[PDB]
Design a protein around this ligand. Structure first.
Ligand SMILES: *SC[C@H](NC(=O)CC[C@H](N)C(=O)O)C(=O)NCC(=O)O
Ligand SMILES: [Cl-]
Length: 218
């Protein structure tokens, strides 16, 4: 038995990270999606508006995706995170995460994630992102080129994925960082997915108990 709760936004890759170990280890967790404009709830918990937040069995709260990942992986004394990391994956992720939000943010803002269920929450998101990283319409109008870019980058990634259940052969923090990106990329209609990338994406979604977004791709 456990009483763990995880406060999230469904679109947030850090929140996906925090959910992964629960799925991989079959540890129950109660997901609670917060409205994107809700400052008060997370502030009561941790003193700031940030997700993910884990509520531990003792009722105390733990923020920071990777701290949650390691706490939960370590709680039973037998971690699954046993593998080496590949500097090439860190580099690839840095490069892709540098431009990918031009595809993702405009699509998140148009999609049925629970954190955007109210018009106010959706507007809050749009306003904040557009005031920081530019026009959603401009980015959407550049989709063809951006889609070709991610397709090209995915072809290299394909050659680096060792197997569908571990990017480097044994599960590592590279899986924790890679899967959320691939999972959010399934919201982007038009991408050419290489075989090994698709197999890893599909298997990891199954093993982590985290849905892909293909059914609402746009
Ligand atoms: S994706 C939503 C945002 N979360 C984070 O960026 C978490 C980063 C932490 N360092 C981590 O958990 O690793 C977020 O909560 N945005 C603030 C907001 O007002 O939406
Ligand atoms: Cl990320």
């Amino acid at each position: 038995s456990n009483a763990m709760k995880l406060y999230i936004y469904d679109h947030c890759p850090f929140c996906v990270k925090a959910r992964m170990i629960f799925g991989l280890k079959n540890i129950p967790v109660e997901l609670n999606v917060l409205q994107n404009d809700d400052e008060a709830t997370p502030t009561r918990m941790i003193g700031q508006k940030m997700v993910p937040i884990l509520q531990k069995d003792d009722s105390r709260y733990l923020p920071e995706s990777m701290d949650i990942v390691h706490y939960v992986d370590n709680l039973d004394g037998k971690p699954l995170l046993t593998g080496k990391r590949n500097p090439a994956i860190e580099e690839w992720l840095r490069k892709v995460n540098g431009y990918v939000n031009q595809l993702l943010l405009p699509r998140f803002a148009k999609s049925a994630f629970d954190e955007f269920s109210t018009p106010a929450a959706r507007q809050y998101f749009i306003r904040k992102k557009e005031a920081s990283s530019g026009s959603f319409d401009n980015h959407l109008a550049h989709s063809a080129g951006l889609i070709k870019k991610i397709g090209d980058d995915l072809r290299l990634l394909d050659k680096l994925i060792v197997q569908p259940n571990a990017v480097n052969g044994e599960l590592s923090e590279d899986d924790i960082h890679l899967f959320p990106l691939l999972r959010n990329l399934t919201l982007v209609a038009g991408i050419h997915w290489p075989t090994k990338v698709a197999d890893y994406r599909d298997n990891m979604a199954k093993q982590t108990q985290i849905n892909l977004l293909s059914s609402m791709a746009i």
